[PDB]
Structures are given as C-alpha cells and as structure tokens.
Design a protein around this motif. Structure first.
Motif, short mmCIF file in Angstrom:
data_model
loop_
_atom_site.label_atom_id
_atom_site.label_comp_id
_atom_site.label_asym_id
_atom_site.label_seq_id
_atom_site.Cartn_x
_atom_site.Cartn_y
_atom_site.Cartn_z
N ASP A 293 0.84 -1.19 0.00
CA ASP A 293 0.00 0.00 0.00
C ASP A 293 0.88 1.26 0.00
OD1 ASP A 293 -2.27 -1.71 0.16
OD2 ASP A 293 -2.56 -1.34 2.32
N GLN A 294 0.37 2.33 -0.61
CA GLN A 294 1.08 3.59 -0.61
C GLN A 294 0.51 4.47 0.49
OE1 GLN A 294 2.58 3.91 -4.40
NE2 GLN A 294 2.96 6.11 -4.27
N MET A 295 1.42 5.03 1.30
CA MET A 295 1.09 5.95 2.37
C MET A 295 1.00 7.37 1.79
SD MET A 295 1.30 4.01 5.05
CE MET A 295 1.78 4.82 6.58
N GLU A 296 0.45 8.29 2.58
CA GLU A 296 0.25 9.66 2.12
C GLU A 296 1.56 10.31 1.66
OE1 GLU A 296 -1.78 12.34 4.89
OE2 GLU A 296 -3.02 12.97 3.19
N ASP A 297 2.65 10.09 2.41
CA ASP A 297 3.92 10.73 2.12
C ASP A 297 4.60 10.12 0.90
OD1 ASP A 297 4.65 8.31 3.27
OD2 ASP A 297 5.89 9.22 4.85
N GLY A 298 3.98 9.08 0.32
CA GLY A 298 4.50 8.46 -0.89
C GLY A 298 5.22 7.15 -0.62
N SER A 299 5.55 6.87 0.65
CA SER A 299 6.35 5.70 0.98
C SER A 299 5.48 4.45 0.85
CB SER A 299 6.95 5.82 2.38
OG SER A 299 5.95 5.80 3.41
N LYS A 300 6.13 3.28 0.73
CA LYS A 300 5.44 2.00 0.84
C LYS A 300 5.24 1.68 2.32
CE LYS A 300 5.46 1.81 -3.61
NZ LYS A 300 5.28 0.58 -4.42
#
Length: 331
Positions: free
Chosen positions: A71-78
């Motif tokens: 899944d992708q988090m808001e900050d762009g990280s996995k």
C-alpha cells in the motif's frame, strides 16, 4: 476484586470500538477489556503494562483490517511489512483470548506482507485465538538485529532496542502461507491448529509456503510447537509446505509430538532463498511426528541434511525449556 474493566459492545457497551477501550486503560493499571459479539473493522495499537482482551469466541468476536505492505502511504512511501498489522500488542504483559484477528487484504503477490498480529509485549499469552492471513500473518518480536533491505523494519519498533520476548499460544488456530509465523521470540505453541493456505489457487516446483521464518539467537529457545496439528489446506499438492525457512541463520524451530499430513515437504525445512541451501547454524527438527489420519509414525529420510536429529536427550531439553517458558508466562 480490583481490576480496571472496560466493556466493548456494538450496542449498550462502555464503548463500541476497541480503540476507545484501549485509550481508556491507564498504562500502569492491570486491566481487562471484554469485547462482545461482532466484527470490529479497526487497526489496533496497544501498549500497556498488564492488559487482557477477552472476545465472545473464535469467529464470534472478529477484529479485522486490510493493510498490506505494498500500500502507498500519504507521504509516498510504501507501508511495508511492519506497518501492515491489524493489531499491535506491546508493553509488559498482554493476554488475548476467544477471538479471531484477521488481515483480509489478500495474497502477498499482489498486496505484499500483511500481519494480522504484531506481538511485541515482553510476555504475550494467546488462548483460543484464531489469526488469519496470507504472507506474514503473525510476527513474534523481536526483529532481527539489522535490516537487509532499506526501510525493511519501518514500523513502530524500528528505532527501538530488540527486546527478547516470551510468548505462549494455547489452543489457537493460525492460517497463512509464506513465513506466516515469524520473528525472534521464544514462543511455545501448544495444541494449536496451523494451516498453510493453498497459494497455488490464490495466484517448476510450486511451493505453497513456509510455516515459520524465525530469526532468534542460537542460545535462546526459539519456536517450539507441541501437540499441534500442522498441515496444508485441503487441495495443497503433496510436499509443497515447509515447516520453516531461516529468516536469519541461527533460526530455531522444533515440532514435538505434532500431527502432520503429506502436504509437508519431504525436505521438511527449506534453506533461505533456495530449498537445498545449507543452514548449519539453525536448530530445525521434528520429534515423533504422527500422520494426522491414522497416528502412524512419520519417517522422512529425505529431509535436508542440516535438519537435526532430535535425540531423547534433546527432546527432554526442549520440553523442559518450553515448560519453563510456559511457567514464566502463566505464573
């Protein structure tokens, strides 16, 4: 009787969510949260000195969430493995009984690793708990000392010391496929049902899974399964389910007096990254495995050469050590 008590119910409870009940508990107070029948779609983070959760029974109280590592988090990280948990249990002493905890995101090939339970407390005691997932269902902390992939341990304990834990699982059911019981805990599983999913339906030699992926130290106990039923799901092809592969090289995992079927691979345990890779620093083994159907003795003389021969002396040692961890946990 002094104990801080919170009742969670869908209706007429102190709260209707487990999260709010956890908030209510002061860290320093011995507490119990009773959770009534229902499906609670929540991601739990619990850190307490001494807390007990008691549901209405397996598949009557269900805690479920669907976060996956890919899944992708808001900050762009996995999101990563160690942020995927449906429930995190940390602190000094946690007890969980009579419920299902599920990560429902799906197969790891599309959704990555996806923990149902991140068991981080110094002392964890699960009884009559069912835990379901695909890849990485149950993490029994601690993490290995160092990552092999950048941000591999991203999660709530990435910065923290690698605290040794003692965990006991009694009468639990645990479902998954790839590395679905993993980590560095001293953990005893007693009278559990452990089932590898038929990965082949959810997606050379096809490997359905690896039950364990330990990463503890050669001087600690590691994973001990006693009197458990261990097998693939109905449909798993012969010899497609390993008892373990070593996530780090001193992995320890033994099955004592367990029932198994022929879904279990002939090699029994895999090397890391390839079936026939030598793992001479592991302590991997079986003692008196019985066929599940007829209780006839299993013989595997095609096991990997690094798999140990548990002598009667080794067996009494492992039994005594599992016994002392059980005392420590339940005492």
């Amino acid at each position: 009787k002094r104990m801080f008590e919170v009742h969670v119910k869908k209706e007429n409870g102190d709260y209707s969510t487990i999260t709010e009940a956890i908030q209510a508990v002061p860290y320093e107070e011995k507490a119990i949260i009773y959770i009534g029948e229902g499906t609670y779609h929540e991601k739990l983070f619990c850190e307490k000195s001494d807390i007990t959760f008691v549901g209405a029974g397996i598949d009557k109280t269900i805690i479920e969430y669907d976060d996956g590592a890919f899944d992708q988090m808001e900050d762009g990280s996995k999101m990563g493995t160690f942020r995927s948990y449906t429930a995190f249990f940390g602190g000094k002493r946690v007890t969980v009984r009579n419920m299902t905890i599920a990560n429902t995101v799906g197969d790891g090939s599309l959704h990555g690793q996806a923990l149902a339970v991140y068991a981080d407390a110094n002392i964890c005691f699960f009884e009559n708990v069912k835990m379901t997932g695909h890849q990485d269902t149950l993490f029994c902390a601690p993490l290995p000392l160092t990552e092999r992939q950048k941000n591999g341990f991203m999660g709530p304990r990435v910065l923290n010391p690698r605290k040794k834990t003692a965990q006991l699982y009694r009468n639990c059911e645990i479902y998954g496929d790839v590395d679905f019981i993993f980590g560095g805990a001293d953990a005893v599983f007693e009278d559990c049902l452990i089932v590898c999913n038929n990965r082949q339906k959810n997606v050379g030699r096809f490997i359905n899974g690896y039950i364990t992926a330990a990463c503890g130290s050669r001087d600690d106990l590691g994973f001990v399964f006693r009197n458990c039923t261990v097998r693939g799901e109905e449909g798993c092809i012969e010899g497609s389910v390993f008892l373990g592969r070593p996530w780090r090289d001193e992995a320890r995992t033994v099955f004592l007096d367990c029932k198994m079927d022929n879904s279990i691979a002939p090699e029994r345990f895999s090397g890391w990254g390839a079936v026939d890779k030598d793992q001479p620093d592991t302590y991997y083994g079986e003692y008196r495995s019985l066929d599940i159907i007829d209780s006839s003795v299993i013989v595997a003389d095609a096991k990997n050469a690094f798999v140990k021969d548990i002598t009667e002396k080794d067996y009494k040692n492992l039994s005594d050590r599992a016994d002392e961890l059980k005392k420590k946990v339940t005492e």
